[PDB]
UniProtKB/Swiss-Prot annotation, chain B:
Description of how the protein assembles with itself and partners: Homohexamer. Forms a ring-shaped particle of 12.5 nm diameter, that displays 6-fold radial symmetry. Part of a ternary complex containing STX5A, NSFL1C and VCP. NSFL1C forms a homotrimer that binds to one end of a VCP homohexamer. The complex binds to membranes enriched in phosphatidylethanolamine-containing lipids and promotes Golgi membrane fusion. Binds to a heterodimer of NPLOC4 and UFD1, binding to this heterodimer inhibits Golgi-membrane fusion. Interaction with VCIP135 leads to dissociation of the complex via ATP hydrolysis by VCP.
Function comment: Necessary for the fragmentation of Golgi stacks during mitosis and for their reassembly after mitosis. Involved in the formation of the transitional endoplasmic reticulum (tER). The transfer of membranes from the endoplasmic reticulum to the Golgi apparatus occurs via 50-70 nm transition vesicles which derive from part-rough, part-smooth transitional elements of the endoplasmic reticulum (tER). Vesicle budding from the tER is an ATP-dependent process.
Post-translational modification as stated in the protein's UniProt record: Phosphorylated by tyrosine kinases in response to T-cell antigen receptor activation. Phosphorylated in mitotic cells.
Species for this entry: Homo sapiens
Annotated compartments: Cytoplasm, Cytosol; Endoplasmic reticulum; Nucleus; Cytoplasm, Stress granule
Entry domain remark: The PIM (PUB-interaction motif) motif mediates interaction with the PUB domain of RNF31.
Superkingdom field: Eukaryota
Family named by the database record: Belongs to the AAA ATPase family.
Mutation effect (E54Q): Does not inhibit interaction with RHBDD1. Increased interaction with CAV1 and UBXN6. Impaired autophagic function. Defect in ubiquitin-dependent protein degradation by the proteasome
Official protein name in the record: Transitional endoplasmic reticulum ATPase
Coiled coil stretches, renumbered: none
Disease per record: Inclusion body myopathy with early-onset Paget disease with or without frontotemporal dementia 1: An autosomal dominant disease characterized by disabling muscle weakness clinically resembling to limb girdle muscular dystrophy, osteolytic bone lesions consistent with Paget disease, and premature frontotemporal dementia. Clinical features show incomplete penetrance. Frontotemporal dementia and/or amyotrophic lateral sclerosis 6: A neurodegenerative disorder characterized by frontotemporal dementia and/or amyotrophic lateral sclerosis in affected individuals. There is high intrafamilial variation. Frontotemporal dementia (FTD) is characterized by frontal and temporal lobe atrophy associated with neuronal loss, gliosis, and dementia. Patients exhibit progressive changes in social, behavioral, and/or language function.
Length: 96, 126
């Protein structure tokens, strides 16, 4: 609803971090499996996680946070309306 | 005040105006039970439009904006809140409040069942 650009960047970075950790842990285990149980025929199934999925983004969004509170946005709105173009000329018309 | 009177006139409803001096008199004299009598009068005159002009007078009297050590609550406004909460079945009586200092007004005034509808009366246009 009100995430800042930094907040969205943090969410994306956290999702990427979760994906990277899962991929590293999975391929590490898979390497144990060959070392523990040497398979007769080598057939790598490629990467167990080749791209960022829905579950990674859901877990990352679980930690999503709004860095910018609504009170500081209220102060900015105050200053913005502190550069107020008056309140009596909005209907200015030349005499014709 | 004229806007409240006009709205009362359109509906052909009696109009009762409780100015700031009356509220301040009830506050200084520590006689806030007369607010109940005011509301009873509103009930007797129903349908009616009970207008509390310049409702912020008591808040100003206690210090304006800085106020005293206490909060926004005061005897007269508290009696008004009690009567307004109990003044729900009547339907006829309509409560209108006016205040030139909305910042110092008691927040409890604006809670549901109270003067919820805030209307900004700005300076007249051309």
């Amino acid at each position: 609803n009100g995430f800042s650009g930094a907040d969205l960047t943090e969410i994306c970075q956290r999702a990427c971090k979760l994906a990277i950790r899962e991929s590293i842990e999975s391929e590490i285990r898979r390497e144990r499996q060959t070392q523990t149980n040497p398979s007769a025929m080598e057939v790598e199934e490629d990467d167990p996680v080749p791209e960022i999925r829905r579950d990674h983004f859901e877990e990352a969004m679980r930690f999503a946070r709004r860095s910018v509170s609504d009170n500081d946005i209220r102060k900015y709105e105050m200053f913005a309306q502190t550069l107020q173009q008056s309140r009596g000329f909005g209907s200015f018309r030349f005499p014709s | 005040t004229l806007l409240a009177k006009a709205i009362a006139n359109e509906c052909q409803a009696n109009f009762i105006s409780i100015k700031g001096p009356e509220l301040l008199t009830m506050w200084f004299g520590e006689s806030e039970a007369n607010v109940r009598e005011i509301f009873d009068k509103a009930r007797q005159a129903a349908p009616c439009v009970l207008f509390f002009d310049e409702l912020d007078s008591i808040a100003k009297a206690r210090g304006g904006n800085i106020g005293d050590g206490g909060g926004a609550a005061d005897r007269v406004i508290n009696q008004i809140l009690t009567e307004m909460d109990g003044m729900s079945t009547k339907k006829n009586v309509f409560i209108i409040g006016a205040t030139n200092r909305p910042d110092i007004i008691d927040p409890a005034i604006l809670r549901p069942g109270r003067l919820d509808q805030l209307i900004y009366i700005p300076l007249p246009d051309e």
